[PDB]
């Protein structure tokens, strides 16, 4: 469950950077 906690927050941060990166490219497009 420690590790589960690690991966949750890790992939959460990942997807939220991809979301922000997509909000940028979308306005540019």
Contacts with another protein, residue ranges (CB under 8 A): 1, 4-5, 7-8, 11-12, 14-16, 18-19, 21-23, 25-26, 28-29
CB of residue 10 to another protein, shortest distance in Å: 9
Please name the residue ranges forming H helices in the chain.
2-28
Q: Measured between alpha carbons, how far is 26 from 5 in angstroms, rounded to an integer? A: 31
CB 13 → another protein: shortest distance, Å?
9
In whole angstroms, what is the distance from residue 3 CA to residue 28 CA? Answer: 38
| Closest distance to another protein from the beta carbon of 16 (Å) | 7
């Amino acid at each position: 469950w420690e590790e589960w906690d690690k991966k949750i927050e890790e992939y959460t941060k990942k997807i939220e950077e991809l979301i922000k990166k997509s909000e940028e490219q979308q306005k540019k497009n």
